[PDB]
Amino acid sequence: EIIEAMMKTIAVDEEGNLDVSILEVGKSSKKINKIEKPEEKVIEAAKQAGIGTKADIEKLLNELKSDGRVYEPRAGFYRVI
């Protein structure tokens, strides 16, 4: 009951994934970052695949710049590395 009440008050995931180990959920996080990682796939894959909203993909491509998943030498054009 303590373990059950802990998982409920945390809301760790929809399917109860162990986000405490990877800091990512399979459905809402791992599936999106797997499909995400001129600008061919930056504009096309964001539309025909329906990966997410404009604000949702913006934070993912931003975090991809730090982890090394999206590289863009120039500001006008952005690419995925």
Residue ranges that bind another protein, judged by CB under 8 A: 21-22, 24, 26, 30, 34-35, 37-38, 40-41, 44-45, 48-49, 71, 79-81
The C-alpha torsion from 74 through 35 and 10 to 1, rounded to 10°, is -160
Distance from chain centroid for Cα 24? 9
| Residue whose CB is less far from another protein, 44 or 56 | 44
CB of 17 to another protein, least distance (A): 10
CB of 1 to another protein, least distance (A): 19
